[PDB]
Design a protein around this ligand. Sequence first.
Ligand SMILES: [Zn+2]
Ligand SMILES: [Zn+2]
Lengths: 98, 119, 203, 237, 49, 56, 30, 56, 214, 56
Amino acid sequence: SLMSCISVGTDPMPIITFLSEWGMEPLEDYVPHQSPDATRVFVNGVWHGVHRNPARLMETLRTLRRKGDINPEVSMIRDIREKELKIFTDAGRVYRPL
Amino acid sequence: TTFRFCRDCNNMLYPREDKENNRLLFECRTCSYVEEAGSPLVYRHELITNIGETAGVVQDIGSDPTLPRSDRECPKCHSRENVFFQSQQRRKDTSMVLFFVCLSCSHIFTSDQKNKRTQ
Amino acid sequence: YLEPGHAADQEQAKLIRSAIEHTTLKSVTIASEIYYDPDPRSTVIPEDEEIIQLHFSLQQSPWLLRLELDRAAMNDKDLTMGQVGERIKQTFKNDLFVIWSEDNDEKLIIRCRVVAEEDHMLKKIENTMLENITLRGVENIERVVMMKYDRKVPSPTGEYVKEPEWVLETDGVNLSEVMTVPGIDPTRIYTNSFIDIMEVLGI
Amino acid sequence: KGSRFISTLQVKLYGREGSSARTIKATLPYIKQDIPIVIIFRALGIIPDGEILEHICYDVNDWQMLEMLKPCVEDGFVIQDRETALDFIGRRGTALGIKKEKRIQYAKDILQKEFLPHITQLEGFESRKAFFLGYMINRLLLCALDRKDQDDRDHFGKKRLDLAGPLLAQLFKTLFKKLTKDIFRYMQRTVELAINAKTITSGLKYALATGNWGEQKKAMSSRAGVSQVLNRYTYSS
Amino acid sequence: TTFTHCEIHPSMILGVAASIIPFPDHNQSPRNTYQSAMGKQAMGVFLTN
Amino acid sequence: LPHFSKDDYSPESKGFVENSYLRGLTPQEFFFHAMGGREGLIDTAVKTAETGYIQR
Amino acid sequence: SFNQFVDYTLQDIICEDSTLIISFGKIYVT
Amino acid sequence: DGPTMREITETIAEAKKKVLDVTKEAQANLLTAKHGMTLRESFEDNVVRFLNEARD
Amino acid sequence: DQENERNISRLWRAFRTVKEMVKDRGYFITQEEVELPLEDFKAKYCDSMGRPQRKMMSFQANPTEESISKFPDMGSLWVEFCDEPSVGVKTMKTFVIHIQEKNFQTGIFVYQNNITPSAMKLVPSIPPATIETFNEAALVVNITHHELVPKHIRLSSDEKRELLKRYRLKESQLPRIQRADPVALYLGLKRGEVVKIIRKSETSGRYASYRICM
Amino acid sequence: HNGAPHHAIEEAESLLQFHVATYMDNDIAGQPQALQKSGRPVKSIRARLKGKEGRI
DNA sequence: TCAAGTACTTTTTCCGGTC
RNA sequence: CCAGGA
DNA sequence: AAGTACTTGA
Ligand SMILES: [Zn+2]
Ligand SMILES: [Zn+2]
């Protein structure tokens, strides 16, 4: 379609570094029954850890993109029901501007 | 059901009958641990399930824009502010009954005019 | 196709529908449960207390297999607690002790006991029960629909007149068996599977 | 980027809807048989059941999913420590590779280099790969318990389009590595500057002319029609 | 009342070829699919050079 | 489509093209007609060789 | 796509498993 | 015709309600499935049937 | 009472079809003999409990005057039923020698469930006489009576010879009925034997086809 | 005919068996495709007669 | 001995370029 | 092979 | 994508 573009592929580390700093508990120290409602956070199908208040994190990440600090071609989705936050710095994804 | 583990091993527990005092126990097959049973029920099958219907009802449920709203007055706080969805139990058979989640009291009420719920 | 006479009789159609459409113990069951109920005479489930009080008056395993049947399901595929129980009883013969809650009684229950090591044994018995026990119907024959097909037939006065009939529509094939069923026209019976027609009725 | 190990891990739920002993086994790269999930966790370091179960099922309440894990626990009951788990994995080759010290050393390498190569291919990351396997078993059971739908293989979000750049990348990597092994050949010959720049040029040249995206005049299977002559009938064309 | 985004223009769902179809919202689905195949074979000035 | 609320079994959501060709189609109507239209083109395409071999 | 390749990707390919008993540094394109 | 177009619009309009009515009926669990069909399968059949009755 | 009466109905329905097949084969059986009611079957072959006494059922049948005109060497037939659901070498040796001594040409064995491979080995043991095995359950319904099953007529050696002469045929060139064919079984056709099929035609009203046995 | 090294013989034999094999049919189960020096496999006689395009 | 797995087989209407 | 035509 | 033909474990 006319407005379609394809993700060139960026670096995941500025986002992984950002996440940990914004309340992301690392998987290496996860205790499922302690934090049982924990939203599981992924960056390119790699489970990095969990977060206790995704509501606020998601807003921070969205403001990061809409500012330019997080690249605009980066995809970030929050499936509330499934308790998941998947991020894509990934190359080859087809996107459209809205 | 709801089963226990062995303190010491953390390994799971297998049921053993105490033939003498006619009572049920739970033995550990890794150490010498034994504990008496809480309930007589050891195994439950459940073919016609209802567990899945109201899944993933995080208090953030209101923050999903994809979810539709209605002006139905709540059974508890009587609030005409609520989000709704269908039985999340992804089966063919499944009825088109709706589950309403209050945007204030968070109570889950249904549209079921055949039966009365608590989940 | 139905027997000559009872061609317009919808109730006869239902009778065959019921006699042919396959029914398994699985289709009626809500859930099966394994309990440790050591006294055969007295029960840890207070609900069942009444079922024992009768199915005793007018030796066995302390491990109980308890299954709940669905009243709504038990009706659409017309069935009785008696007839369901009878199948189980007649399947496992004298190596399984069966009791059942009455069709009247609120919850629908079947209590089963065998005649060291018994836990796995009963888990096999419940699989046999759900998967292998056939209640009603013929094997391979599922979803049987009743249909009011229109049939042109000569009238006493001579002229060919519309005399519609009740016809059954299967979701599966078993020629040999459904043909030998009382209440049908074994002269009229058709299958889309001509491979079957060949095998049963000749080349 | 880097070699690109196209190892696909399958986590299999044995037994059908109505069959007794519904076990969960997983086919590991370079291992002939599918290992029961439990032994994998044990070989990873997550030794007692329940510590294993914690990685799979996140709700202690959910009895339904937990009953579904009891057979697996029974299947992995034979193996009780990390070592015996690696031997069991090492036994099932490979080929077999006979010798006790050899097979246990193998399984270490497979779990490190071929099992879940994204995440990390580094050493001390058993915790990360265990929780992931547990997230996979959670999803396997979630679908089998009819709570989630089977994955739409046709969802566009799950597809990628490789344009000119990634296409060239794949082909350039192939050739630069062919040059690297020709650099090694002239260094071996020098028992004491002859680096054929033709291989890089002619390689790219071949691919883009024929549209047979691969090395080189000995192509099949290579994907023909990747590069093609631009339609110049009309501007819109 | 939940709207997170808005469509720049719905006509943008179309590709280069379909975007020359006048009133494609008034044609039967494949007739449009046909034009976005034929216009590729239509003569004209391809480049000024 | 992302222009709809979840669990929408309405005619407008599941592909009912309310309008005439003379009136014109809404973007949603247009895309759904396009999905339905594509189905026929697929069988036209396939049938062509399947049908050919049957003949042979 | 091509721009991302030349500027970045191409350099990374040049130095990943490259080094031989001889290393490959910064890349230049005429 | 101008009035034929009013008459057409009001034909779809009434069929649109007839559909909402079966939907409200299905959401309230009052719908009774046809022997050998899902409660949902039965519903979709009705919806599809009304909407076609309408187009015609 | 229970579900006992239904196994009786079935055995009687089976018996009717046996009688039907026998008359059809070309043996002397009456219509009233075939059309025997259920009540009359009960009060004949049922004990002091109304349980079917299949040993009583077993009967002999002779070729009709008409049959000896077409097939002279067509001898007598013996139809034996059995009260034992599984029939073994013990009950079989009894029936086998029975046919050899009474100089029977053909013999049918209607069995409930099975015939042991021990007993089945005695089937082609006494030629020129021939033995047939029929599972009672197949015979509950006469397949020949079906809408789709047309009139098959067995041809004589002379009738066959004539067919081939009239159409200038080799047995190769004729359409073939399979030996195991439900109707080929019902008619007890032997390899080489020919059937004349008379079917209705939307084209000609009546069409005659022929099939040779496999 | 010469000093038979007896294994170099069963070796030279099996190669001839292969050539006389791949000459008639080159598209055999056990994969080595007797590929021409150009990668392109050698066109067997079987290939020449094999259906649609080619002889028959 | 007999279900289930394995190999290996097989097709698909007619009419320029660049290599 | 690739691109197209009915 | 759907077969024959043959082989393998219970
Ligand atoms: Zn223990
Ligand atoms: Zn409320």
